[PDB]
Design an enzyme around this catalytic site. Structure first.
Site, PDB file in Angstrom:
ATOM      1  N   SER A 255       0.745  -1.202  -0.032  1.00 37.63           N
ATOM      2  CA  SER A 255       0.078  -0.057  -0.137  1.00 37.63           C
ATOM      3  C   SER A 255       0.946   1.149  -0.003  1.00 37.63           C
ATOM      4  O   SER A 255       1.614   1.442   0.876  1.00 37.63           O
ATOM      5  CB  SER A 255      -0.797   0.052   1.384  1.00 37.63           C
ATOM      6  OG  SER A 255      -1.780  -0.844   1.381  1.00 37.63           O
TER       7      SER A 255
ATOM      8  N   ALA B 275      -1.334   0.108   6.075  1.00 37.91           N
ATOM      9  CA  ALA B 275      -1.200  -0.895   7.033  1.00 37.91           C
ATOM     10  C   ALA B 275       0.325  -0.279   7.714  1.00 37.91           C
ATOM     11  O   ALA B 275       0.814   0.058   7.107  1.00 37.91           O
ATOM     12  CB  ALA B 275      -0.952  -2.009   6.693  1.00 37.91           C
TER      13      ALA B 275
ATOM     14  N   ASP C 276       4.113  -3.321  16.104  1.00 37.44           N
ATOM     15  CA  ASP C 276       4.063  -4.371  16.974  1.00 37.44           C
ATOM     16  C   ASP C 276       3.130  -4.178  18.173  1.00 37.44           C
ATOM     17  O   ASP C 276       3.138  -3.766  19.255  1.00 37.44           O
ATOM     18  CB  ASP C 276       5.315  -4.979  17.746  1.00 37.44           C
ATOM     19  CG  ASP C 276       5.285  -6.412  18.227  1.00 37.44           C
ATOM     20  OD1 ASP C 276       3.991  -6.875  18.384  1.00 37.44           O
ATOM     21  OD2 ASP C 276       6.165  -6.960  18.605  1.00 37.44           O
TER      22      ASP C 276
ATOM     23  N   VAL D 264       0.827  -6.896  18.898  1.00 40.33           N
ATOM     24  CA  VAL D 264       0.571  -8.403  19.125  1.00 40.33           C
ATOM     25  C   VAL D 264       1.589  -9.289  19.938  1.00 40.33           C
ATOM     26  O   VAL D 264       2.932  -9.175  19.326  1.00 40.33           O
ATOM     27  CB  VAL D 264      -0.037  -9.334  17.919  1.00 40.33           C
ATOM     28  CG1 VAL D 264      -0.287 -10.615  18.664  1.00 40.33           C
ATOM     29  CG2 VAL D 264      -1.111  -8.565  17.277  1.00 40.33           C
ATOM     30  N   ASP D 265       1.515  -9.533  20.959  1.00 39.13           N
ATOM     31  CA  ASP D 265       2.351 -10.244  21.900  1.00 39.13           C
ATOM     32  C   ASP D 265       1.604 -11.750  22.096  1.00 39.13           C
ATOM     33  O   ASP D 265       0.718 -11.756  22.380  1.00 39.13           O
ATOM     34  CB  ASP D 265       2.595  -9.446  23.135  1.00 39.13           C
ATOM     35  CG  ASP D 265       3.716  -8.366  22.901  1.00 39.13           C
ATOM     36  OD1 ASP D 265       4.133  -8.336  22.017  1.00 39.13           O
ATOM     37  OD2 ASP D 265       4.069  -7.672  23.938  1.00 39.13           O
TER      38      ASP D 265
ATOM     39  N   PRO E 241      10.000  -7.763  22.579  1.00 34.87           N
ATOM     40  CA  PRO E 241       8.580  -7.865  21.920  1.00 34.87           C
ATOM     41  C   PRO E 241       8.704  -8.967  20.497  1.00 34.87           C
ATOM     42  O   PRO E 241       7.595  -9.014  20.017  1.00 34.87           O
ATOM     43  CB  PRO E 241       8.310  -6.549  21.551  1.00 34.87           C
ATOM     44  CG  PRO E 241       9.554  -5.776  21.360  1.00 34.87           C
ATOM     45  CD  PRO E 241      10.505  -6.584  22.112  1.00 34.87           C
TER      46      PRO E 241
ATOM     47  N   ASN F  49       4.823   1.137   3.031  1.00 37.09           N
ATOM     48  CA  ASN F  49       4.626   0.063   4.279  1.00 37.09           C
ATOM     49  C   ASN F  49       6.119   0.187   5.035  1.00 37.09           C
ATOM     50  O   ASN F  49       6.534  -0.845   5.787  1.00 37.09           O
ATOM     51  CB  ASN F  49       4.359  -1.223   3.873  1.00 37.09           C
ATOM     52  CG  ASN F  49       2.800  -1.297   3.205  1.00 37.09           C
ATOM     53  OD1 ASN F  49       2.788  -1.577   2.127  1.00 37.09           O
ATOM     54  ND2 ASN F  49       2.025  -1.126   4.019  1.00 37.09           N
TER      55      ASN F  49
ATOM     56  N   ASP G  63       6.558  -7.910  15.032  1.00 31.05           N
ATOM     57  CA  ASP G  63       7.505  -9.097  15.229  1.00 31.05           C
ATOM     58  C   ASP G  63       7.702 -10.054  13.941  1.00 31.05           C
ATOM     59  O   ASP G  63       8.609 -10.960  14.310  1.00 31.05           O
ATOM     60  CB  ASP G  63       7.226  -9.750  16.672  1.00 31.05           C
ATOM     61  CG  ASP G  63       6.009 -10.534  16.535  1.00 31.05           C
ATOM     62  OD1 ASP G  63       5.912 -11.511  15.872  1.00 31.05           O
ATOM     63  OD2 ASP G  63       5.077 -10.039  17.465  1.00 31.05           O
TER      64      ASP G  63
HETATM   65 CA   LIG Z   1       5.300  -8.787  19.612  1.00 32.30          CA
END
Ligand SMILES: [Ca+2]
Length: 764
Positions: free
Chosen positions: A1, A69, A73, A75-76, A205, A241, A252
């Site tokens: 994008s 987008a 990070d 999300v863990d 992370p 991006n 990650d």
């Molecule tokens: Ca992460």
């Protein structure tokens, strides 16, 4: 994008220009939906993915917006300590907490149902269970519980009229998304939006953390930390991006890197070469970047150096000379099947051999295959997404920079041998494979062009049209699925803002029961291929002048009225006086244009495809149900204000008003695909509407992690190089931050203040 926003100081014959090219793949019907909303405080025009109530690409006459987008990070993974004797319990703060569970049954058309249970802990849904270590891995998203709020922040930002008003909605968008701003006064801005966790010190992370309590997030970071810029000194905001700002950490995911090698430099190059851009020149950046080979600029200096002592009679030299005379633009020959120059095939063969000899060799199997792709991988169908610099190539580029690179090379990717030796060896392998195919004369090679396919299956792998609707396009173009441009305060003409877009194949996906396609089924397909565009109307004068149809609708709830006006490309404009009525007109026109697609997106986002299509979609249905928690979405909806709730309710009821008319006379109104696949459309609810957004935006662009795979890689790296060197190799393949990464916000403007702790972490 990609996106380029050009402000006052860099725009020619205008105050600001915004050009957006979001890359989602190519589909029939179109991924995005053109819509105009007028009333209830809204006066907006543009297009948006899956017809969301919020218009992601558009303007309101005062400000324009867009997105790419974010790639951060958010999300863990929490490694939950399981109990040997207690099934369904995990350890948190000295106690044995019970897991939430829910039982699901996937009904299967002409098949056998499939039952399973989804597990959830205080960290998130359980994605994997390793019995050997008694661990249940749980996926923690910083945006969990903010899905519906993120959709409503995208809807309310449509009414913002200045930077402070717009950034107030940008602060309520919890997904990792880059948001862009431009206005009538020439002001430009950028916010890397999202909810990001405030992590314990020494929380790496990139790898999982024990979920026993000591590593739980301290909560969320404030919006003040989110990278942002308003009227940068440069006079432009460019993104493809890449990294939002210096020292800001990427997702990650092991294939995702922000390093010295970045495709955004291709846009920066074009924008820096000239001081001012007109609307037509800004739009032309699409044509230029769409045909650009992304590896030529990176590796040509090393290739010329490696072949400098070779005479023209050497085939390795003939290859580099062919690259050295090329402009880097790919053009198709008159045959429609081959490229005019063989450069991309040469770079592909060279990079493939280079990666086998360098990055793949250093990484133990089966992890070597993670860095083997050259970035040119394609089928006769063409690439399904954008073309980028591969992860292996990004790491190889750092090694080639050597001294110039800020990444410590804990392992010599060239294995002791000088890099010129490896470069000539890969050139010889490239020469061997390519001459066997096209003969020994490089000047006569006609290498295959990358083609493009408008797929009849959505990005999930589920039909959203009959297979016969798939369309071929001879030229693959590394550009947005849609492109839109907004020009503020043009010097020419009697309009304060001008906008254009292209929504191919067309505004409508409707095919009548007799096979007759709607007039707007594919009237934008040739316009897309030829880099053309159509006008976006906002004012009632422009809409009424270019109208093709006009109708009134009586809202079933209060017998109120909505006026629907469609332009010459079938784009609907909704006129209503309250929030419920506005969104009711919106849902109604979506059902007229994209019913079969939206019904399939509904089944895709909830995991109910097998119910109508059979056993082929069982593993897909199961995986969707495992990746969300319906009670959380229903609770988020139930706690909405009456105003926010009317947006979802109006939209759903509007769809139902058209669905009822369809089911009253199917022989004239039922989309042909409902007959082809053997089922009928049914009513929608605010739940269905919210789940189109959650399933296609939050899950596709804001749910990316590879922490468990990262742990397996790091474990193998320590096994090969020893505990100390293995961690330093991990930092060379999957660095947390790379200061040489090209950033959307200049280093002069600001940097990420949050520095991360290397010494003593969860991996100690
Ligand atoms: Ca992460």
């Amino acid at each position: 994008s990609n996106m380029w926003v050009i402000g006052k100081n860099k725009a020619q014959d205008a105050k600001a220009i915004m050009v957006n090219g979001p890359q989602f793949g190519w589909y029939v019907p179109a991924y995005t939906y053109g819509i105009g909303l007028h009333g209830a405080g809204y006066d907006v025009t543009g297009n948006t993915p899956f017809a969301y109530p919020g218009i992601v690409f558009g303007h309101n006459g005062t400000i324009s917006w867009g997105s790419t987008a974010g790639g951060g990070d958010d999300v863990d993974i929490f490694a939950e300590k399981l109990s040997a004797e207690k099934p369904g319990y995990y350890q948190h703060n000295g106690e044995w907490v019970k897991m939430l569970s829910r039982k699901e049954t996937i009904a299967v058309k002409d098949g056998q149902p499939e039952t399973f249970t989804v597990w959830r802990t205080l960290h998130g849904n359980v994605i994997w269970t390793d019995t050997a270590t008694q661990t249940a891995y749980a996926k923690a998203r910083a945006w969990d519980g903010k899905e519906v709020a993120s959709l409503l922040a995208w809807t309310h930002q449509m009414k913002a009229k200045n930077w402070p008003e717009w950034t107030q909605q940008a602060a309520k968008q919890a997904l990792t998304i880059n948001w862009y701003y431009a206005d009538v006064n020439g002001n430009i801005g950028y916010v890397h939006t999202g909810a990001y966790p405030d992590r314990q010190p020494g929380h790496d992370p990139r790898l999982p953390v024990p979920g026993t309590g000591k590593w739980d997030w301290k909560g969320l970071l404030s919006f003040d930390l989110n990278p942002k810029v308003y009227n940068p000194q440069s006079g432009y905001i460019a993104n493809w991006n890449n990294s939002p700002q210096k020292d800001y950490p990427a997702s990650d995911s092991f294939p995702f890197l922000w390093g010295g090698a970045d495709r955004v430099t291709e846009i920066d190059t074009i924008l820096d070469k000239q001081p001012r851009f007109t609307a037509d020149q800004a739009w032309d950046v699409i044509r230029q970047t769409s045909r650009r080979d992304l590896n030529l600029r990176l590796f040509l200096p090393a290739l010329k150096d490696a072949t400098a002592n070779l005479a023209e009679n050497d085939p390795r030299r003939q290859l580099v000379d062919k690259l050295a005379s090329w402009d880097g633009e790919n053009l198709v020959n008159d045959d429609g099947k081959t490229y005019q120059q063989p450069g991309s095939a040469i770079l592909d063969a060279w990079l493939t051999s280079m990666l086998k000899r360098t990055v793949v060799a250093a990484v133990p199997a089966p992890f070597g295959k993670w860095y083997s792709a050259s970035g040119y991988e394609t089928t006769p169908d063409g690439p399904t997404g954008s073309l980028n610099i591969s992860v292996g190539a990004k790491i190889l580029y750092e090694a080639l920079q050597g001294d110039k690179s800020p990444i410590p090379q804990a392992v010599d990717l060239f294995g002791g041998k000088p890099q010129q030796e490896v470069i000539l060896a890969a050139l010889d392998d490239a020469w061997q494979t390519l001459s066997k195919r096209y003969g020994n004369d490089v000047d006569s090679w006609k290498t295959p062009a990358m083609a493009l396919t408008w797929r009849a299956n959505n990005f999930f792998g589920v039909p959203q049209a009959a297979a016969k609707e798939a369309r071929p396009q001879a030229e693959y173009q590394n550009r947005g699925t849609e492109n839109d441009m907004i020009v503020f305060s043009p010097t020419s003409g009697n309009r304060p803002v001008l906008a254009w877009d292209v929504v191919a194949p067309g505004q409508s996906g409707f095919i009548a029961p007799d096979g007759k396609k709607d007039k707007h089924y594919d009237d934008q397909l040739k316009m897309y291929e030829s880099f053309g565009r159509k006008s976006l109307w906002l004012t009632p004068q422009d809409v009424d002048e270019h109208q093709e149809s006009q109708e009134v609708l009586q809202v079933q709830l209060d017998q109120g009225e909505v006026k629907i006006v469609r332009d010459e490309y079938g784009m609907p404009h909704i006129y209503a006086d309250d929030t419920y009525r506005l969104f009711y007109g919106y849902g109604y026109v979506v059902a007229q244009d994209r019913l079969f697609q939206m019904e399939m997106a509904r089944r895709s986002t909830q995991g109910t495809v097998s119910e109508v299509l059979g056993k082929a979609f069982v593993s897909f249905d199961k995986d969707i149900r495992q990746n969300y928690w319906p009670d959380s979405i229903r609770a988020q909806i139930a706690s909405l204000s009456a105003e926010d709730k009317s947006i979802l309710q109006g939209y759903a009821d509007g769809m139902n008003a058209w669905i009822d008319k369809v089911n009253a006379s199917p022989d004239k109104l039922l989309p042909q695909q409902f007959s082809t696949f053997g089922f009928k459309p049914k009513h929608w609810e605010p739940f269905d509407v919210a789940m189109i957004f959650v399933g296609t935006m939050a899950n596709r662009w804001s749910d990316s992690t590879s922490e468990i795979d990262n742990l397996a890689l790091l474990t193998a790296l320590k096994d090969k190089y020893g505990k100390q060197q293995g961690m330093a190799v991990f930092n060379q393949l999957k660095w947390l931050v790379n200061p040489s990464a090209p950033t959307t916000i200049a280093a002069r403007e600001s940097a990420y203040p949050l520095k991360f702790d290397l010494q003593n972490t969860q991996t100690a």
